[PDB]
Nucleic acid binder design. Structure first.
Lengths: 82, 95, 68, 73, 93, 110, 95, 80, 92, 110
DNA sequence: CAGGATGTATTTGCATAACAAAGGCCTGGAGACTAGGGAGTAATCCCCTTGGCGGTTAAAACGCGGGGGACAGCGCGTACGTGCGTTTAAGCGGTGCTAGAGCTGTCTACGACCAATTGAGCGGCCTGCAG
DNA sequence: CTGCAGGCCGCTCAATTGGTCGTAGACAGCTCTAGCACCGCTTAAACGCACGTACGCGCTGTCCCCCGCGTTTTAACCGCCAAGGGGATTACTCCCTAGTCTCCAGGCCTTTGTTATGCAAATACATCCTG
């Protein structure tokens, strides 16, 4: 059983992403808001990948199932599949 | 000789934009994926490549969001990012 | 002018090696025996192929001329 | 212009025919496996003429084609 | 000489909930566009599921999965409950 | 849960009002697949009917909110928004003469 | 004996959020559609319902943009809408 | 004909803005709004025309407008 | 395994930049690319055939699909090459 | 194109490099249609090949900007963005290890 | 100037390819061949689309003054950034176990297909009433 | 009062029924991949602290651009008509593409032993932010 791995995303990890996006100054409240958003984005993707996996009556989620999960979101992951 | 505030920030913006690798730690991310997955079903597994695919999607997502967030703050005549700047971007995006 | 001198020798070295039934590894190892400084077959290959810098070819050439 | 045969290849050529023909209905896949092992079990003297023939073929090949180089795609 | 509409079925469904409530022809036009939109999407995803599993047939199972992928939350759930029932029942005596 | 599985009309046998036999035909066409199962159009018809009912139920309530006894395109629009899950499903749909919600922001007030 | 500025504007927001009627005049709209169409081909025709179908989409589009635009101005701590507020919303939307 | 972008009057723009919750409109908005509307129309019309041409016909139907909108990530109900 | 275009992508690159190589990952990106575009064009072409009540997709449907999917001039060059390739193919 | 009618393969007949015969085959699957024409895969293969070339050309240039002799996912990513048209077609595509453009707004600078 | 700290260009070894030789096997592609249903052509009729016409009148254009809100500038407080030293667990490599993915072959309940049978729904018209 | 609604007739063709036929998917059974759990060790990244000031916030005052009416001008809308161009339907005809079968060309496997070939490390200049 896993718990609270949302805190496994360190402040630096968030900061670095924000920096890549052009962010220079970050409010201490951002870290929590960012986490809420990440979690939802990630959760929706996983759920669809799991749903596809379940339909196929399999146990292991494949990278291709993640790709399908993204495809429907209007996104693609090149280099991982079709 | 300490570099004044903002010198590093510009270097870090520059540097991460230039780089191509991951910014989020792998094991922490992998666990986050699973913690969430456990709420859909027990005893689920992932290919190592599936975890990588998820992380790649997540970082790309957050970076794009931060860029829009940054623009919102700029429009507001600020440099520091507030939670609301994120929310505005998401709202406009229909998220 | 230096480029040509090195090109000419590299061609001669390759021909000499082949004629005498030696490998590139043999040249590298023999230079070790002769001068105390060992070279890999990669270096020898790159020498014959002129894929090395001028200074590296210049430092190595004398040893290879003697090897022949 | 093709590549000259190495020590193993010169030898395996002789044994290719000495296995393919003497032991009929055997796949080349199987012959190659066996010949690989058979070569490894040869003494230096047994390998020698093939090792030197490979040298001779390489020298001869280059003599016939002075500018020949190995370039794979 | 005309494509079939669902206006007769939409009308009937309305009255089973609000038997004293009428509906305009324009509203029916909206509902007909609606039914075709949902149909198309589910059938579309069902096609993908069959494709992903290298199949040629769509069954009640693909429709079920397709519903979950397309619909959110509780609506997806009830749609699944009713669909599951209708089929479980369909093949029953 | 009916005891009547004898009905010839597939929609009736399925306990549905929607034209199951047609849904079969529609799934067959459009090249969604090469083969269509027996339970496929049944499952789908139930889904289409369920969602249809939910919109109409909520729209009927919208009509009442406006003190009316009829559904018009506007009442359908209000119904879609009132139900958050329904809103998402149809959140990108433009409704002919649907109008918008009466959303007034506090910052615009005196 | 004027209603104070902002009184009517607020009331009009309320009223336009109640109506379903088209706001853009029909003939002017139709003509705009045609002149645009001529950039692809002349002597082209449209069904009368096609023009109305297009207008419904156009108004819905602009209103949705105005809502996001309004949020941008609010984020800027003000009421008045500037071209920038439109551009920010569009950028975020990916237009 | 030409100059139909002026056919979208200030009131027309304003009323739409009002429906969206806008109280105050800068004089610069009217022109910016038009630029945006025009682009929307160009993309939708062009595709509707493209579909019409594919069908080897001359009249654009409501359905062709619908398909043009469909690829913008939108649907329109009540027109087919 | 699955069909890929790694051999074709490699060759196309060298017709443009004969002295430039390409990583296996980049090839993976290009394989995703070809599959994506293929699906989209075939998908739209399917709609065109469906909409006009046809059972066959021909070069024309592809042409229309290309115009709808590709922007600007990029679309034109694709159309020109497509039109030509068909012309050449049958003109033999 | 070629000045000859002679061909050895369908692709060589078209004058294309892409596997035209396969494209035809792929179009028969996925249930896009019941029937596929002969000119369809020829037309399509040319399109796929053309677009492929454009990305690769620009990526080769991106590789040059970095003084490299090799295309990597990053170079493909830069190529896509620099070309406005490709930046729409693939505008929303995530490239594994593609990175982002080095864009910093003036307001963030001294 | 005058020093400290970071970033490119330019050289080196470590795996790991591609070729040689032989010939049986795989399978994908190209080349014919016929069958028959899809798409193309021409002819026919009738809808709706365009265009023009004149009159009414709601909406738009324009002027004007008032004042509410955008804007710039000022000053104060703090939360954000910047190092520094200490602590954490992420990452690496290697070990060992087996659960589940993937492939093969059997065979059989299912769906496509056809021809015969049947009545729920289409179209138009009658007729009067609710929003 | 327009447009909604149920009732009526008479089809009429889409739906239902009941059989044959072949095969896509269910099912069991075997192989062995890669996913999981675990341990130890190194060390880059993370945690927490103290200190300083650049940025965010609120307040004040200036003035200028937008709002709210009143009056005048515009063309949008309404109802009406006539002309004819294009869309829909129909029958008839050809010929393109699925479906089947035949046969060939190339690539694959398979082993050691050269010649490269493509990079992660090392090392020497440039470049930059304070004195």
């Amino acid at each position: 059983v896993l718990r609270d791995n949302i805190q496994g995303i360190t402040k630096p990890a968030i900061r670095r992403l924000a920096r890549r996006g052009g962010v220079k100054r970050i409010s201490g409240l951002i870290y929590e808001e960012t986490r809420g958003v990440l979690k939802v984005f990630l959760e929706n993707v996983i759920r669809d990948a799991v749903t596809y996996t379940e339909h196929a009556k399999r146990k292991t989620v494949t990278a291709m199932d993640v790709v399908y999960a993204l495809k429907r979101q209007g996104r693609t992951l090149y280099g991982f599949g079709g | 000789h300490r570099y004044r505030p903002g010198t590093v920030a510009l270097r870090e913006i520059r540097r991460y934009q230039k780089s191509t690798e991951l910014l989020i730690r792998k094991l922490p991310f992998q666990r986050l994926v699973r913690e969430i997955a456990q709420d859909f079903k027990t005893d689920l597994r992932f290919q190592s490549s599936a975890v990588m695919a998820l992380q790649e999607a997540c970082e790309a997502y957050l970076v794009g969001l931060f860029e829009d967030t940054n623009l919102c703050a700029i429009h507001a005549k600020r440099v520091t990012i507030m939670p609301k700047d994120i929310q505005l971007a998401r709202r406009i995006r229909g998220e | 002018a230096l480029q040509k001198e090195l090109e000419q020798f590299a061609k001669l070295l390759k021909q000499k090696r082949i004629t005498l039934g030696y490998t590139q590894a043999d040249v590298g190892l023999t230079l070790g025996v002769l001068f105390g400084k060992v070279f890999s077959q990669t270096t020898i290959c790159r020498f014959e192929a002129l894929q090395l810098s001028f200074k590296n070819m210049c430092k190595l050439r004398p040893l290879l001329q003697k090897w022949v | 212009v093709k590549r000259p045969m190495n020590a193993f290849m010169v030898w395996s050529r002789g044994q290719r025919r000495k296995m393919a023909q003497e032991n009929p209905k055997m796949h080349n896949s199987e012959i190659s496996k066996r010949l690989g092992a058979e070569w490894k079990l040869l003494s230096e003297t047994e390998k020698r003429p093939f090792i030197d023939e490979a040298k001779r073929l390489r020298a001869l090949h280059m003599k016939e084609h002075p500018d020949y180089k190995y370039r794979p795609r | 000489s005309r494509k079939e509409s669902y206006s007769i079925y939409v009308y009937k469904v309305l009255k089973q909930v609000h038997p004293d409530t009428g509906i305009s022809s324009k509203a029916m036009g909206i509902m007909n566009s609606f039914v075709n939109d949902i149909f198309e999407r589910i059938a579309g995803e069902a096609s993908r599921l069959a494709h992903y599993n290298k199949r040629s047939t769509i069954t009640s199972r693909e429709i079920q999965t397709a519903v979950r992928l397309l619909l959110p939350g509780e609506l997806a759930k009830h749609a699944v409950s009713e669909g599951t029932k209708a089929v479980t029942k369909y093949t029953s005596a | 849960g009916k005891a009547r599985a004898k009905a010839k009309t597939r929609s009736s046998r399925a306990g549905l009002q929607f034209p199951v036999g047609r849904v079969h035909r529609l799934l067959r066409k459009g090249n969604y697949s090469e083969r269509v199962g027996a339970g496929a159009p049944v499952y789908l018809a139930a889904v289409l009917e369920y969602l249809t009912a939910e919109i109409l139920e909520l729209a009927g309530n919208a009509a009442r909110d406006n003190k009316k006894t009829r559904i018009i395109p506007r009442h359908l629009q209000l119904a879609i928004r009132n139900d958050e899950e329904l809103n998402k499903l149809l959140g990108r749909v433009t409704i002919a003469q649907g109008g918008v919600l009466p959303n007034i922001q506090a910052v615009l007030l005196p």
